[PDB]
């Protein structure tokens, strides 16, 4: 807590640096995100895996805002602290540095909060930052920014009275006493489903993602894909399943059909896309549908497998966004028809593209393979057909993945030259994390 105050105050000192010292501004904003990565690694060192489920607790009196660490929050916090310095390497202005610093404060505090009102306050305080990040004046899109902000606001406004309903019902929004009291679970369950089915892209409230994740800059796309979608999953695992479990059983056919149609229809839409960033953007919806069904199965080790799929997606899809961002930065287009023969002109970039293509399709020696196997073990244990639907549709994911790769990488060599040292080192931590988590993830 004292450490967190010191890290925030060190991060906020970027504004006071005079702008004529360019080197100092770059180094200060990069170190301001490097330090929380070290602190979260130390928190992993301090964790007792044979101890209590909630460790390193702190509660700030009668102000809500109570905090604690479990395994899902700790893995997601480690992933966020990895992803934020890479975002710092892709920005050039103090406005970008400050927006991403404020976003990192809000994400890190939202991932480990234990109060529902605290979760509401901390998460969607990032709405105006996302609006300004997506609708930036010369190269953004105001339509996309309006869509993402309005969908998130709609879901949050459905949740807010139900939050206050359980608060008047039992006397607290602390999740440890909300899980032990008697509450009207249908109303609160519908409010929580309303927020987290927009955060996780679940059809029909999913149309904001294709616009926002493409109109964003490369750093914004890395953040939005790798981090902000998983707040819906940790919302399911931390707040909704412990507090309204009767609802979570009774809504299972509806959540199940939403997940199945989201998976199938989003995979079918990904095949007709002609923009590389839109191809990468749609593929995330099917993965999150598998995550949601694995969470809702509650069957074998469902929290473990679903968290592991969230980590595998958060490693693999930001790297695909990084490669598309390199192509866009040095060729000024994201259109497939302008790219051919990238193997001959960018051999290192095409090799990285192929490896992350194989990772996104859940091939072995990548963490997505272990993730999808364990998620389908959790789904299979409820019924065999709910697993069969995901199993037989694997040709549809590989079709779009290999079609996009084969169209842009082979053929007549036209396009930009190979990657620089900076682009390679933006990609590199994700590759090392993927090789480790896909070969020896546990000990």
């Amino acid at each position: 807590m004292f450490i967190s105050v010191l890290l925030i105050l060190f991060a906020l000192c970027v504004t006071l640096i005079p702008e004529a010292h360019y080197h100092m501004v770059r180094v200060w904003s990069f170190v301001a995100t490097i330090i929380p990565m070290w602190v979260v690694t130390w928190m992993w060192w301090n964790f007792d895996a044979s101890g209590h489920g909630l460790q390193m607790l702190v509660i700030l009196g009668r102000s809500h805002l109570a905090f604690g660490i479990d395994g899902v929050a700790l893995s997601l916090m480690l992933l966020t602290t990895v992803l934020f310095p890479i975002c710092m390497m892709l920005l050039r202005t103090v406005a970008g540095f400050m927006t991403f610093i404020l976003l990192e404060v809000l994400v890190l505090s939202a991932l480990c909060v234990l109060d529902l009102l605290g979760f509401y306050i901390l998460f969607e305080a990032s709405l105006i930052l996302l609006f300004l990040l997506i609708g930036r004046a010369p190269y953004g899109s105001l339509e996309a920014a309006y869509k993402i902000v309005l969908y998130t606001m709609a879901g949050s406004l459905v949740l807010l009275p139900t939050l206050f309903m359980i608060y008047s019902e039992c006397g607290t929004t602390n999740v440890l006493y909300m899980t032990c009291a008697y509450n009207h679970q249908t109303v609160l369950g519908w409010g929580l489903l309303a927020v987290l089915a927009v955060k996780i892209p679940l059809m029909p409230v999913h149309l904001w993602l294709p616009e926002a994740h493409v109109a964003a800059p490369t750093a914004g796309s890395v953040l939005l894909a790798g981090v902000l979608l998983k707040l819906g999953g940790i919302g399911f695992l931390r707040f909704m399943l412990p507090v309204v479990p009767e609802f979570c059983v009774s809504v299972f056919p509806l959540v199940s059909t939403l997940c199945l149609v989201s998976f199938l229809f989003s995979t079918l839409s990904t095949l007709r896309q002609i923009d590389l960033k839109k191809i990468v953007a749609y593929s995330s919806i099917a993965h999150m549908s598998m995550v949601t069904l694995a969470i809702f199965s509650q069957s074998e080790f469902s929290a473990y497998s679903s968290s592991f799929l969230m980590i595998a997606h958060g490693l693999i899809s930001p790297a695909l966004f990084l490669i598309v961002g390199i192509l866009y930065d040095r060729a000024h287009t994201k259109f497939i028809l302008y790219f051919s023969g990238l193997g001959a002109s960018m051999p290192i970039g095409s090799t990285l593209f192929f490896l992350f293509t194989l990772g996104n399709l859940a091939f072995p020696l990548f963490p997505n393979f272990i993730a999808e196997v364990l998620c389908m073990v959790s789904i299979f244990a409820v019924h065999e057909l709910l697993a069969y639907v995901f199993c037989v549709c694997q040709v549809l994911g590989a079709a779009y993945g290999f079609w996009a790769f084969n169209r842009v990488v082979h053929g007549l060599p036209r396009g930009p030259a190979d990657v620089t040292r900076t682009e390679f080192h933006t990609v590199l931590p994700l590759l090392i994390g993927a090789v480790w988590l896909g070969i020896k993830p546990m000990a």
Partner: protein
């Protein structure tokens, strides 16, 4: 011989069709459909009606003998019984539904072993 000449494919100089992503233009001449034989003339000028018409006879010409022997012929056509085993060896060998020893019509539990070799799909509870 690397470096052989190859003709390049022209760029679009007219308005594009709405569903243009069904043509694969890799840069060289000629391009192809996204999947072969989805449009354009088929090899030998055959059509789908040709293959469906020939298959509507040819498929029953191949499925005819299997049906005849599976419904009008049985284990007793053979001039000998299956391979004989001691009881302790046989009793585990015929536990497999896969085994060819269930066609032993001279076994004292021939019917019961055949009734246990019925394929099921959903495991009951």
């Amino acid at each position: 011989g690397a470096g052989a000449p190859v003709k390049l494919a022209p760029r679009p100089d007219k308005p594009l069709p709405t569903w243009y992503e069904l043509w694969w233009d890799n840069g060289y001449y000629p391009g192809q459909p996204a999947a072969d034989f989805m449009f354009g003339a088929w090899p030998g000028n055959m059509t789908e009606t040709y293959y469906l018409r020939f298959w509507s006879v040819f498929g029953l010409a191949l499925a005819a003998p299997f049906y005849y022997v599976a419904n009008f012929t049985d284990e007793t056509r053979m001039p000998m019984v299956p391979q004989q085993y001691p009881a302790e060896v046989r009793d585990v060998l015929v536990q497999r539904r896969n085994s060819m020893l269930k066609h032993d019509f001279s076994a004292p539990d021939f019917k019961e072993v055949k009734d246990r070799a019925k394929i099921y799909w959903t495991p009951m509870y």
